Amino acid sequence: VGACVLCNSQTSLRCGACIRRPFLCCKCCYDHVISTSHKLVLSVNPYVCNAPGCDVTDVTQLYLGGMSYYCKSHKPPISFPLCANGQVFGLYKNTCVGSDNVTDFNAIATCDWTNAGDYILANTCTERLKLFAAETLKATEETFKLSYGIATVREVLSDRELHLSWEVGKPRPPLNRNYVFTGYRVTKNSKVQIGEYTFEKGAVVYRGTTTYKLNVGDYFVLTSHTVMPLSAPTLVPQEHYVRITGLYPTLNISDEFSSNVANYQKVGMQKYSTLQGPPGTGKSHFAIGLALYYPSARIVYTACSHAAVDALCEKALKYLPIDKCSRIIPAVECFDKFKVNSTLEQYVFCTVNALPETTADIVVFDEISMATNYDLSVVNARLRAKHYVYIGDPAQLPAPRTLLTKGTLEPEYFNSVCRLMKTIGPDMFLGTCRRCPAEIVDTVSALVYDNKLKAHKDKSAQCFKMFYKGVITHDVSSAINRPQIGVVREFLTRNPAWRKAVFISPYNSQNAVASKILGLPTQTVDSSQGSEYDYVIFTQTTETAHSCNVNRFNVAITRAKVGILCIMSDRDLYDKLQFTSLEIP
C-alpha cells in the first residue's frame, strides 16, 4: 500500500502481469490496463475468480461478488463489475489523477528490451519510469542468465581444464568473464560451497579466483540475487551555491595537481559535477588532490568495482594517512590494505555493491559510462551528501547489454547524467596527459574529444599502423582469424624486443589460440582501462559493429605510454589514424 508511479497518490493495486509490479493508481492503473496484455492486477488479494477451480484471470473479465471476485460464469445474481467507470476498483478510489499519455509507461512495461529504441525509452522517459526501467532491465537479465544449463563438471582431467556438460534444452552461456559463475556443491541432500568461476576455450579452461580443486558431479550456474526496488533519483535536482560556505578553504596546496585546484573550487559552490575524464588524465589522480585540498571531507569514493575503485585506492594511503581510509567488502578478494567494516570513516571507498547507507560530504564516482541509471541512483540512495562528483567519461565504455539486439545505443545516452555533458556540456575537464604522448592523444581528440586534449610529449613513432584484411571464421561465441594471428608473430618477429607486450584482442579466445603461439599475456578489450603497458599488441580480428565502433577499442588504442600495435583490418576509422605504415610481409 503506497503511492502509484504515474500519480503519486496512495494506491493499493499492483499490475500482476507486469514484471516489477509497481503501485498503480485506480484511474492510472486502468490507463495501464487498457493498452497492454498486463490484464491481471493484484490488490490485497489477487483479482481472480475464486470460484473453486476456475481459469479466468483478466481484470475486466471479473465482477465483484460480495466477499469474492467472479467471472460471469460464476458471478452471483448480485454482481458489480470490478473494472468500470474508467476507474478500476481498489482502495482510495477517489484520489486518482492519471496521466493523459501513459503509453510512455505502457511502453516501458511492454518493452521486452531488444532494440536500441528500448534504451531510448529507458533514458528519454520520465523518472519513476527511469527507476522502473533500469530495474526491469536488471530483473529480466538475471532471469536471462538462468535460462541456461547447469554447468556440471562431470569428469576432471587436469588442472586449468575440466570435463563439463550442462542441463537439457537450454542454449549456452558465452565465453568470458562478464558472466562469472558462482557454483556450489552438494552432499547427499542440499547445496553448499564451491566458488567464483567461468569457463572458456580449452577441454574447459576455468579461471577460478580462489584456490580449490573440483570433484565429480561438480556443477555451476550463474547464481542470482533478488533485485529490490530503488529509491533516490539518479541525480538530485542540483544547483550552484552562492559561496563555498560550509566547506573548508585550505591555505596550502600541492601543485603536482595544479590542473586540479581550480577544478575543485566551484565544486564546493555546486551540488554535482561530472567531469570530462579522458583515460589517464590524472582522473584517478584528480579525486586524490581534493583529498588533500579538503582533508576535512567525508568524501564518497565509489566505482563499478574494487577493480575500479581499486584504482581509487591505488594512491589512497600513498597520499592520505592510513586509518582514515576504509572499504566495505561484503562477506570478493581485491584490495585489502584498509581497515574493513567501518562506515563512519573519514574516507570511505567502495563499490555500488555494499557501502551502507549514511550521509557524507562530496561524492566522487568512478565508472560512469559502464554503469547505468540503476546504480546511478544507488549512491544517492546510499547517501545524501554535501555535494557530488562523477569521475570517468561516457567517452570510455558502456555496459554489456545482454538483451540489446538491434544497433548499439549512443555513447551519449549511457545514462541520465551522460547526456548532460552532451546537452549541458562538460562540468570539468582534465587534459593532463601524463600517459600517452603526441602519438595517439590528439588523434583521439579529433575522434570525439573536441580537439581538446593536447600533446603530452614527443612522438617517438612507437604506436603502429598496419593496413591489412585477414580472414575470419566463426564458432560458438567467438571469432577466430589467423591470417592476422599469423601477422601477429610476423609482426612480432623482426625484433624480439617487440614481444615484451600484452596481446590485445576482442575475441579473447583468439588469444586462447594466440597464447599457445606466443606466450604473450591477454588483454580484455572492455575491462582494460586503468591497466596498460607502453607496449601492447592488438589484433582487432573483426571490423563489425561488435568490433571497430568508435569508442570500444578506443580504450585499447590508448593503452600505450608510447608504443601500441594496431593491425587495422577495418576501413572504419583507419581513414584517420596517423601512424607509421609499412608493407605487410
Binding site: 470460484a51 473453486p52 477451480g53 460464476h74
Partner: protein
Amino acid sequence: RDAAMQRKLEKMADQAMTQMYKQARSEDKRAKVTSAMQTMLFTMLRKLD
C-alpha cells in the same frame, strides 16, 4: 419460467458442482495424509534395532 424457474436450476447445478468440487478435494487430502502416516510408520520402524 422459460426464464425464471430454470434460472433456479442455474442455482442448483452451480451449488452441486461446487459441493462435489469440495468433496474431490477432501478425498485427495485423505490419500495424501494416508501416504504420510504410513511412510512415518515405515520410517520409524527401521530404527527399531
